[PDB]
Scaffold this active site. Structure first.
Site, mmCIF file in Angstrom:
data_model
loop_
_atom_site.group_PDB
_atom_site.id
_atom_site.type_symbol
_atom_site.label_atom_id
_atom_site.label_comp_id
_atom_site.label_asym_id
_atom_site.label_seq_id
_atom_site.Cartn_x
_atom_site.Cartn_y
_atom_site.Cartn_z
ATOM 1 N N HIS A 257 0.818 -1.203 0.000
ATOM 2 C CA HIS A 257 0.000 0.000 0.000
ATOM 3 C C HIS A 257 0.853 1.254 0.000
ATOM 4 O O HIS A 257 0.400 2.303 -0.467
ATOM 5 C CB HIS A 257 -0.941 -0.002 1.198
ATOM 6 N N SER B 283 -0.268 -1.168 -6.121
ATOM 7 C CA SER B 283 -0.179 -2.442 -6.810
ATOM 8 C C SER B 283 0.231 -2.250 -8.268
ATOM 9 O O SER B 283 0.039 -1.189 -8.863
ATOM 10 C CB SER B 283 -1.510 -3.181 -6.725
ATOM 11 N N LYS C 206 -14.931 -8.573 -7.457
ATOM 12 C CA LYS C 206 -13.978 -9.448 -8.129
ATOM 13 C C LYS C 206 -13.399 -10.465 -7.154
ATOM 14 O O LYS C 206 -13.386 -11.677 -7.419
ATOM 15 C CB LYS C 206 -12.869 -8.604 -8.748
ATOM 16 N N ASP C 207 -12.931 -9.987 -6.002
ATOM 17 C CA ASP C 207 -12.415 -10.905 -4.999
ATOM 18 C C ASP C 207 -13.510 -11.814 -4.467
ATOM 19 O O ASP C 207 -13.224 -12.930 -4.040
ATOM 20 C CB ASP C 207 -11.754 -10.127 -3.864
ATOM 21 N N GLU D 85 5.333 -33.608 2.416
ATOM 22 C CA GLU D 85 4.096 -33.255 1.744
ATOM 23 C C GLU D 85 4.397 -32.738 0.341
ATOM 24 O O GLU D 85 5.521 -32.347 0.027
ATOM 25 C CB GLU D 85 3.336 -32.208 2.549
HETATM 26 C C1 HEM Z 1 0.681 -15.341 3.665
HETATM 27 C C2 HEM Z 1 0.748 -15.318 2.339
HETATM 28 C C3 HEM Z 1 0.598 -14.062 1.589
HETATM 29 C C4 HEM Z 1 -0.394 -13.149 1.704
HETATM 30 C C5 HEM Z 1 -1.582 -13.171 2.622
HETATM 31 C C6 HEM Z 1 -0.118 -12.124 0.782
HETATM 32 C C7 HEM Z 1 -0.989 -11.050 0.689
HETATM 33 C C8 HEM Z 1 -0.874 -10.151 -0.331
HETATM 34 C C9 HEM Z 1 -1.817 -9.167 -0.625
HETATM 35 C C10 HEM Z 1 -3.105 -8.928 0.112
HETATM 36 C C11 HEM Z 1 -1.352 -8.478 -1.685
HETATM 37 C C12 HEM Z 1 -2.083 -7.336 -2.312
HETATM 38 C C13 HEM Z 1 -3.110 -7.905 -3.287
HETATM 39 C C14 HEM Z 1 -2.386 -8.437 -4.485
HETATM 40 O O1 HEM Z 1 -1.608 -7.727 -5.064
HETATM 41 O O2 HEM Z 1 -2.597 -9.689 -4.909
HETATM 42 C C15 HEM Z 1 -0.109 -9.028 -2.067
HETATM 43 C C16 HEM Z 1 0.666 -8.562 -3.110
HETATM 44 C C17 HEM Z 1 1.936 -9.058 -3.396
HETATM 45 N N1 HEM Z 1 2.561 -10.084 -2.816
HETATM 46 FE FE1 HEM Z 1 1.803 -11.191 -1.328
HETATM 47 N N2 HEM Z 1 1.008 -12.371 0.102
HETATM 48 C C18 HEM Z 1 1.498 -13.542 0.536
HETATM 49 C C19 HEM Z 1 2.640 -14.214 0.127
HETATM 50 C C20 HEM Z 1 3.513 -13.655 -0.782
HETATM 51 C C21 HEM Z 1 4.723 -14.227 -1.162
HETATM 52 C C22 HEM Z 1 5.246 -15.537 -0.646
HETATM 53 C C23 HEM Z 1 5.312 -13.369 -2.071
HETATM 54 C C24 HEM Z 1 6.598 -13.550 -2.765
HETATM 55 C C25 HEM Z 1 7.712 -13.871 -2.123
HETATM 56 C C26 HEM Z 1 4.435 -12.267 -2.244
HETATM 57 C C27 HEM Z 1 4.706 -11.213 -3.082
HETATM 58 C C28 HEM Z 1 3.750 -10.251 -3.384
HETATM 59 C C29 HEM Z 1 3.931 -9.245 -4.424
HETATM 60 C C30 HEM Z 1 5.137 -9.081 -5.302
HETATM 61 C C31 HEM Z 1 2.811 -8.506 -4.436
HETATM 62 C C32 HEM Z 1 2.534 -7.339 -5.337
HETATM 63 C C33 HEM Z 1 1.438 -7.680 -6.334
HETATM 64 C C34 HEM Z 1 1.427 -6.654 -7.428
HETATM 65 O O3 HEM Z 1 2.142 -6.793 -8.384
HETATM 66 O O4 HEM Z 1 0.615 -5.597 -7.343
HETATM 67 N N3 HEM Z 1 3.340 -12.469 -1.435
HETATM 68 N N4 HEM Z 1 0.163 -10.061 -1.205
#
Ligand code: HEM
Ligand SMILES: CCCCCCCCCCCCCCCCCC(=O)OC[C@H](COP(=O)([O-])OCC(O)COP(=O)([O-])OC[C@@H](COC(=O)CCCCCCCCCCCCCCCCC)OC(=O)CCCCCCCCCCCCCCCCC)OC(=O)CCCCCCCCCCCCCCCCC
Ligand SMILES: CCCCCCCCCCCCCCCCCC(=O)OC[C@H](COP(=O)([O-])OCC(O)COP(=O)([O-])OC[C@@H](COC(=O)CCCCCCCCCCCCCCCCC)OC(=O)CCCCCCCCCCCCCCCCC)OC(=O)CCCCCCCCCCCCCCCCC
Ligand SMILES: CCCCCCCCCCCCCCCCCC(=O)OC[C@H](COP(=O)(O)OCCN)OC(=O)CCCCCCCCCCCCCCCCC
Ligand SMILES: CCCCCCCCCCCCCCCCCC(=O)OC[C@H](COP(=O)(O)OCCN)OC(=O)CCCCCCCCCCCCCCCCC
Ligand SMILES: CCCCCCCCCCCCCCCCCC(=O)OC[C@H](COP(=O)(O)OCCN)OC(=O)CCCCCCCCCCCCCCCCC
Ligand SMILES: CCCCCCCCCCCCCCCCCC(=O)OC[C@H](COP(=O)(O)OCCN)OC(=O)CCCCCCCCCCCCCCCCC
Ligand SMILES: CCCCCCCCCCCCCCCCCC(=O)OC[C@H](COP(=O)(O)OCCN)OC(=O)CCCCCCCCCCCCCCCCC
Ligand SMILES: CCCCCCCCCCCCCCCCCC(=O)OC[C@H](COP(=O)(O)OCCN)OC(=O)CCCCCCCCCCCCCCCCC
Ligand code: HEC
Ligand code: HEM
Lengths: 116, 244, 60, 65, 388, 70, 31
Positions: free
Chosen positions: E207, E211, E233-234, E277
């Site tokens: 944020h 994004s 959408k979500d 697993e």
């Molecule tokens: C507990 C697991 C995770 C949760 C709850 C989580 C949650 C979120 C949320 C809510 C967003 C904003 C919505 C979205 O852009 O899809 C986001 C974006 C993002 N997350 Fe995660 N995430 C998780 C794991 C990861 C992991 C493991 C990575 C990579 C190592 C990652 C990398 C990113 C990136 C790069 C974005 C930016 C998306 C964009 O391009 O706008 N996330 N994540």
């Protein structure tokens, strides 16, 4: 080496594919440079004329709207598109050269990236 | 030899409870439990199936109470401090043929007859594997000699198993009027074991069907809702004052 | 069109009435789906249920 | 009852798996001829019985009550 | 605009932060259904936490009662089978949607500037998820749980200076026993809350910078609020995930599992096929493929080194792979190689699987060793294709 | 984090004055044409290695099985 | 104020119906 589409069939195909994609979305190759990415692009865009920057913003908005609507530019404007007609690379090169000189002899960075 | 180590693969039989809306054949469950308590209960133990589990599935409560009263169970110290024995109750579990694993091994020549409670889930492809193993007591191929005291079973990983063929043709007398063939006993015992390893199958499948259907309806509504909300943006016309 | 507008003017002028309608419809639909799925279950697997074995009460 | 549905159906579908049985019999011939060390060919046995069991599987439960 | 009197209860200080960061946070208007996976991993985490608490009201961390207690939840507790299947298949779903999250990030180069901190916090979240799932899988105390714990914790003795000391400290004794079970239970209970905190920091960083989008371009020209445009959408994403999860709970509740775990753990007997697993399989495959087990642990560390080093590469001004044909093909090859490597993990360690896993690991690291070269070479594209 | 105004003119329509779910199946063959034409390279790259490796593994396994089967 | 009273009564009816649907005390309700 320096491989251009005139002396490389693979480079010719690569350029053809890039031209096709950019023409589909109707935005020049320079429009892909994110100001938040480098902060040198930010300065180069700050130095460019307002007409050019406004055209860049309009093209980007059109591309984003087409992306949301899940459609492409109509074939007329698609044939009217001119990708790779650059407007930013010279200014970006000047900015980077100035930054390199300033860093090379004394000098503090004129701008810096926040953490993060 | 790797083939023998893995064991011969077992086929896919059409079980009456295999599907999305098929239930256990409770008559088959009752017959399989009879076969277990007559022949298999001497060596293998369940120890996870209480007597109360049988009511409303294979037997009535009076039948289960009588069956439990058939057997004896040790009970906690009385007022005098001694460990006494009383007839079993509805809430007791299935008896154990052996006091401990070492006793079982000594009785069976070093082999431990595994607990049969989750045998259809403990073994890969459990139901088919158990049915084939019980019924596939065949003759070893040419050149292979099983060490004395063991019996050959192609589907058993390793080739030679410690139990002999127990599902002998005409070993039990069914209480309903079904001829006790080896295949009949195999199917009934596998049905009983599969119930004992998954007593929630019927309720689980009913819930699954209902909720898959209902959530598909919800998905249709959610798609309509999204298309209605985004209909303003996805059909706008914007004039931008730029061409190329 | 007319039917939808009529039921709209019946049950979509106050949100409290709408919430009551939503809850009542959820309950009735849940019970109806239960009944339908149970009838399909009975039709599919007949002759297997507990109160169907011929000797259910003769272990005494 | 002396009859057995599984054995009966195995005998019934015996002529539908002739090729693996022929190969297994040829190997039995070879092993008897050699009779030197510890050679064995459980592979033909596995193929033949696997195909036979694949055959018998549906009819067995159809004919089982 | 002087706030002399109240207009909107959303803008009051009690609901102002939520208003901003949930209802009014601007997002690009062209996001696809690939961002719902980020929205959905949080739902999976919440499901895991709730089902885990209600399971822990019935689980006993002793070594003579863990398996019987799990079976008690299976049989006696009303709705207990639903809770246990929800917890297990929900761990599986959590990892599935997180993998989709990661791979969308890789495809659209979301790791690039200025979201280095977002990617790094994601990697830390991945570590936490892996540790939580493992220490939780040891809890039911089956054959697979016991022997997987033994193998993996014993393979922590590859560190040169300390090794056996750390292994003995971690085991609480000389072998995986009751002390390790109790310790693993307490840690499994604690870690998900650190995971919630890490998720909150993840979202805070994102944020901060906003994004990305499929085009990968600057997108502060055409933006819309989160609610209601992306809420619905979500919602579609959540309902589809619910249908998937309901299929995986009520019809195939053990397909993703391993049957040998339904055997009470027996330290005097080893199962013929000790494997983790399905969602630890690629890591296990790399570890086994590299011989000289110390080298295997070094390779496992190097995997996370590469993941953390991804956002700090060279110029590569164009980021979205929709305009990068070579990077697009490279990404598809990487995904295929990861799937193949995951397949290899379940296979035995005999031939030819050793060679297939040794080549696959090399390709996996070559992906990270080739992208900076792609960026360096592509830095000089406009000068070559220009139409002047 | 600022907005960048563009000087556009935007005409929008009420969501209740235009049909909702028809555009899903409107112009379907051209949609499938696009989905297949612009992505066959990607599907080839994703699946080709997998099916090739599976074929190689099965070939090797069967050849070893025959060789070792005496 | 009368309109507010009617709205409050209707909302109370809705909440009571929701609680009844959640608890399902059809067996309990003797009167
Ligand atoms: C507990 C697991 C995770 C949760 C709850 C989580 C949650 C979120 C949320 C809510 C967003 C904003 C919505 C979205 O852009 O899809 C986001 C974006 C993002 N997350 Fe995660 N995430 C998780 C794991 C990861 C992991 C493991 C990575 C990579 C190592 C990652 C990398 C990113 C990136 C790069 C974005 C930016 C998306 C964009 O391009 O706008 N996330 N994540
Ligand atoms: C087939 C006909 C599809 C018709 C259709 O919907 O077309 C519209 C759709 C429009 O495409 P688009 O413009 O990208 O729209 C995407 C928008 O995001 C769409 O925007 P949206 O948010 O409105 O999305 C609405 C959503 C809404 O979806 C629905 O309403 C469908 C929900 C139906 C109920 C689902 C129940 C699922 C139950 C599963 C049970 C599984 C049991 C498994 C058992 C296993 C046993 C072993 O529908 C779709 O996304 C389209 C269908 C997607 C699924 C296919 O076009 C397609 O789906 C094309 C299908 C063919 C693609 C190429 C395939 C090539 C294969 C080569 C080999
Ligand atoms: C030989 C040549 C064969 C060529 C085949 C090409 C093809 O199938 O392209 C379809 C499609 C590409 O069509 P496209 O419109 O050019 O690209 C889609 C846009 O990027 C994004 O546009 P989009 O938002 O319309 O597409 C996103 C996609 C999203 O699809 C998925 O997330 C499914 C992933 C399956 C793996 O959703 C749909 O296609 C519409 C249905 C969405 C329902 C909601 C799903 C939420 C997650 C459900 C729970 C999952 C747990 O393929 C994919 O999106 C990837 C398929 C799975 C790869 C792994
Ligand atoms: C070695 C690889 C050298 C590639 C040289 C540049 C190729 C550029 C090109 O146009 O490649 C063809 C194609 C992508 O181009 P295009 O046909 O436009 O794809 C979308 C519509 N089909 O396909 C590709 O670009 C695929 C490239 C795969 C590279 C894999 C490298 C390992
Ligand atoms: C896994 C095993 C453990 C060991 C791992 C060891 C590291 C392996 C990977 C190394 C990768 C590179 C590390 C060095 C940092 C990046 C170097 C760099 O280029 O930084 C510069 C960059 C921009 O700065 P710039 O504007 O150039 O500076 C002005 C100077 N004229 O600076 C920036 O853009 C600032 C970026 C800020 C965010 C950095 C996040 C780093 C990772 C943190 C992870 C942990 C986060 C904390 C929470 C969990 C704690 C456990
Ligand atoms: C049982 C509990 C279970 C757990 C619940 C969730 C725990 C969350 C933990 C982290 C919370 C961190 C604080 C979040 C709220 C916050 O920062 O509110 C700021 C606001 C300060 O007031 P104001 O200066 O007006 O700010 C709004 C406009 N600037 O604050 C306020 O005005 C007061 C906000 C109160 C809380 C609102 C929610
Ligand atoms: C950079 C990212 C972060 C770093 C970490 C790595 C992240 C990786 C992200 C992706 C993870 C993918 C995980 C894949 C799990 C595969 C599980 C598996 O091997 O299943 C095999 C199984 C086959 O059946 P089975 O009888 O069990 O096999 C014989 C075993 N004796 O079942 C199957 O085969 C079912 C299908 C499995 C998946 C497709 C495999 C296709 C390729 C195999 C054939 C070639
Ligand atoms: C495997 C690697 C094969 C390519 C090696 C050369 C290289 O790295 O070239 C980089 C460049 C990548 O181009 P790419 O980023 O995919 O798309 C354009 C948007 N920047 O690719 C090119 O410029 C390729 C041009 C020559 C054709 C291949 C030789
Ligand atoms: C039998 C068929 C019944 C069909 C009823 C609807 C008739 C209809 O007009 O269907 C078309 C409609 C989409 O129409 P639209 O996109 O607005 O444009 C076309 C305008 N004629 O299509 C739709 O609106 C279909 C999508 C919405 C379906 C929602 C179903 C919800 C059911 C909930 C049951 C709960 C039980 C518990
Ligand atoms: C009722 C007819 C029975 C069923 C069903 C099964 N058995 Fe037995 N059994 C016995 C021993 C000594 C062993 C150990 C052999 C070994 O582990 O090598 C077994 C083993 C089994 C197994 C395990 C198969 C596997 O590990 O894959 C199953 C599924 C099984 N048995 C089913 C001994 C006896 C015994 C004492 C003589 C009797 C009456 C039974 N088994 C009866 C049944
Ligand atoms: C505070 C939250 C959590 C609690 C209290 C909790 C508690 C438990 C308990 C008591 C068990 C043993 C019961 C059983 O085996 O079914 C268990 C198992 C398990 N947990 Fe958790 N858990 C929590 C969060 C998580 C999370 C976030 C994950 C995934 C990352 C997870 C993954 C697992 C797995 C894989 C098992 C093994 C399931 C099995 O094979 O039976 N848990 N958890």
């Amino acid at each position: 080496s320096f491989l251009d589409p005139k002396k490389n069939w693979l480079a010719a195909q690569h350029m053809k594919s890039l031209v096709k994609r950019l023409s589909k979305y109707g935005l020049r190759y320079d429009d892909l440079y994110d100001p938040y990415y480098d902060l040198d692009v930010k300065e180069a865009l700050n130095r460019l004329p307002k007409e050019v920057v406004d055209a860049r913003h309009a093209r980007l908005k059109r591309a984003i709207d087409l992306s949301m609507k899940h459609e492409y530019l109509p074939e007329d404007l698609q044939a009217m598109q001119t990708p790779f007609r650059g407007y930013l690379q010279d200014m970006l090169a000047l900015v980077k050269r100035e930054r390199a000189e300033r860093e090379a002899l004394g000098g503090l960075p004129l701008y810096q990236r926040s953490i993060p | 030899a790797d083939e023998a180590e893995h064991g011969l693969a077992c086929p896919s039989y059409p079980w009456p409870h295999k599907g999305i809306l098929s239930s256990y054949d409770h008559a088959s469950i009752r017959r399989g439990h009879q076969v277990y308590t007559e022949v298999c209960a001497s060596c293998h133990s369940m120890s996870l199936i209480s007597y109360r589990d049988l009511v409303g599935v294979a037997y009535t409560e009076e039948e289960v109470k009588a069956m439990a009263a058939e057997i004896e169970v040790v009970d906690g110290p009385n007022d005098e401090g001694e460990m006494f024995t009383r007839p079993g109750k509805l809430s007791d579990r299935f008896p154990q043929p052996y006091a401990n694993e070492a006793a079982a091994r000594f009785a069976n020549g070093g082999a431990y007859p595994p607990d049969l409670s989750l045998i259809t889930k403990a073994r890969h492809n459990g139901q088919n594997y158990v049915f084939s193993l019980l019924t596939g007591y065949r003759d070893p191929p040419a050149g292979v000699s099983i060490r004395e005291g063991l019996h050959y079973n192609p589907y058993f990983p390793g080739g030679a198993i410690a139990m002999p063929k127990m599902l002998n043709d005409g070993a039990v007398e069914y209480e309903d009027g079904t001829p006790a063939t080896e295949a009949q006993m195999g199917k009934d015992v596998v049905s009983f074991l599969s119930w004992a390893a998954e007593p929630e199958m019927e309720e689980r499948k009913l819930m699954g069907f209902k909720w898959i259907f209902v959530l598909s309806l919800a998905l249709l509504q959610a798609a309509y809702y999204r298309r209605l909300r985004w209909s303003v943006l996805k059909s706008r016309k914007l004039v931008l004052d730029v061409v190329n | 069109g007319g039917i939808f507008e009529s039921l709209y003017k019946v049950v979509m002028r106050r949100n409290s009435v709408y919430v009551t309608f939503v809850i009542a419809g959820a309950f009735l639909g849940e019970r109806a789906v239960d009944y339908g799925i149970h009838k399909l279950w009975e039709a599919n697997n007949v002759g297997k249920r507990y109160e169907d074995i011929p000797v259910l009460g003769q272990k005494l | 009852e002396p009859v057995d549905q599984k054995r009966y159906l195995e005998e019934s579908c015996k002529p539908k798996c002739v090729k693996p049985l022929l190969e297994y019999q040829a190997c039995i011939k070879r092993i008897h001829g050699d009779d030197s060390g510890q050679k064995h060919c459980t592979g033909q046995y596995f193929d033949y019985w696997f195909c036979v069991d694949k055959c018998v599987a549906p009819k067995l439960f159809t004919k089982l009550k | 605009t002087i706030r002399n009197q109240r207009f909107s209860l959303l803008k009051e200080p009690i609901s102002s932060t939520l208003n901003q960061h949930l209802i009014d946070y601007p997002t690009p208007s062209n996001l696809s259904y690939w961002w719902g996976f980020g929205s959905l991993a949080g739902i999976c985490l919440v499901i895991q936490i709730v089902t885990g608490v209600f399971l822990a009201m019935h689980y006993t961390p002793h070594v003579d009662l863990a398996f019987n207690s799990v079976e008690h939840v299976m049989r006696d507790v009303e709705g207990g089978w639903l809770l246990r299947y929800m917890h297990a298949n929900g761990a599986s779903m959590f990892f599935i949607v997180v993998y989709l999250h990661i791979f969308r990030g890789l495809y659209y180069a979301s790791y690039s500037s200025p979201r280095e901190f977002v990617w790094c916090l994601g990697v830390v979240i991945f570590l936490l998820m892996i540790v939580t799932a493992f220490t939780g899988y040891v809890l039911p105390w089956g054959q697979m749980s016991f022997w997987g714990a033994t193998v993996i914790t014993s393979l922590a003795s590859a560190i040169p200076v300390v090794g056996d000391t750390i292994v003995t400290w971690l085991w609480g004794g000389f072998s995986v026993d009751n002390a390790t079970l109790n310790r693993f239970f307490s840690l499994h209970y604690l870690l998900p809350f650190l995971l919630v905190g890490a998720s909150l920091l993840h979202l805070a960083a994102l944020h901060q910078y906003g994004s990305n989008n499929p085009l990968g371009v600057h997108s502060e020209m055409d933006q819309i609020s989160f609610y209601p445009y992306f809420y619905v959408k979500d919602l579609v994403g959540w309902v589809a995930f619910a249908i998937f999860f309901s299929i995986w709970i009520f019809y195939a509740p053990n397909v993703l599992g391993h049957p040998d775990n339904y055997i009470p753990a027996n330290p005097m007997s080893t199962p013929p096929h000790i494997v983790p697993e399905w969602y630890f399989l690629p890591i296990y495959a790399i570890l086994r493929s590299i011989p000289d087990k110390s080298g295997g642990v070094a390779a496992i560390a190097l995997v996370f080194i590469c993941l953390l080093a991804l956002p700090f590469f060279k110029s590569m001004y164009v980021r979205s792979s929709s305009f990068r044909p070579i990077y697009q093909g490279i990404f598809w090859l990487l995904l295929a190689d990861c799937l193949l490597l995951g397949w290899i993990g379940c296979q035995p360690v005999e031939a030819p699987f050793v060679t297939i896993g040794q080549i696959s690991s090399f390709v996996f690291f070559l992906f990270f060793a080739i992208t900076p070269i792609l960026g360096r070479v592509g830095r000089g594209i406009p000068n070559s294709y220009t139409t002047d | 984090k600022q907005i960048v105004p563009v000087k556009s003119v935007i005409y929008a329509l009420s969501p209740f004055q235009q049909k909702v779910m028809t555009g899903l199946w409107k112009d379907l063959p051209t949609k499938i044409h696009h989905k297949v034409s612009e992505n066959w390279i990607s599907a080839t790259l994703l699946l080709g290695p997998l099916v090739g490796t599976y074929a190689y593994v099965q070939n090797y396994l069967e050849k070893e099985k025959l060789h070792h089967r005496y | 104020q009368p309109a507010d009273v009617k709205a409050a009564a209707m909302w109370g009816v809705a909440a009571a119906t929701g609680g009844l649907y959640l608890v399902q005390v059809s067996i309990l309700v003797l009167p």
